Amino acid sequence: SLAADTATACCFSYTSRQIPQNFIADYFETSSQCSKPGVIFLTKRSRQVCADPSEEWVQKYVSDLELS
Amino acid sequence: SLAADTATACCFSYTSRQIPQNFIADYFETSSQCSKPGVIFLTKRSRQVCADPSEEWVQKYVSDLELS
């Protein structure tokens, strides 16, 4: 099940404060074509939050999502 | 009326063939932070189409949208 082609989402700035984990609904990695490495978190209320893939809390949140 | 911050849409490739103009519903210019200059057209069926801002048919479609 492939996705219809579409503009690419990119992160040009990261959130400076960690999101409460109970807000997190999903995540996905941004394209490498983008200027900066990126993790976009999706909240329960469908807010998009750009995050630094190198930060530990980001890596933790991603891991918790993947292993459940 | 400002917009909630969000991942930035970017175009990393342009459509190679011109869209039928009666398909076009709206347009917007992509951020300059993006790698490439971009016009994203939005079709009646909400398809997103990346287009080269330098091409004449793109400039024409944008003009027709702006002046109506």
Residue numbers in the entry:
A (entry chain A), B (entry chain A): 2 to 69
What did the original publication write about this model?
CC chemokine ligands (CCL) comprise 8-14 kDa chemotactic cytokines (chemokines) involved in diverse immune functions. Extensive structural analyses reveal that most chemokines share a common core structure: an N-terminal extension followed by a 310 helical turn, an anti-parallel three-stranded β-sheet, and an α-helix. CC chemokines also readily dimerize, primarily through the formation of an anti-parallel β-sheet at their N-termini. Certain chemokines, e.g. CCL3, CCL4, and CCL5 form polydisperse, high MW reversible polymers in excess of 600 kDa without the assistance of GAG.
Mutation of Proline 8 to alanine (P8A) profoundly reduces the polymerization of CCL3 and CCL4. CCL3 P8A crystallized in space group P6222. There are five CCL3 molecules in each asymmetric unit. CCL3 P8A still arranges as a polymer structure similar to wild type CCL3; each dimer rotates 36° to bind to the adjacent dimer such that a decamer completes a 180° turn. However, the N-termini of CCL3 P8A exhibit substantial heterogeneity, indicating that these N termini are more disordered than wild type CCL3 and can adopt multiple conformations. One such conformation results in the loss of a hydrogen bond between D6 and S33 in CCL3 P8A. This disrupts a key contact between CCL3 dimers. The loss of contact between CCL3 dimers and the conformational disorder of CCL3 N-termini likely contribute to the decreased stability of the CCL3 polymer, leading to depolymerization. In the CCL3 structure, however, the P8A substitution disrupts crucial contacts between CCL3 dimers to reduce the formation of CCL3 polymers without affecting the dimer formation of CCL3.
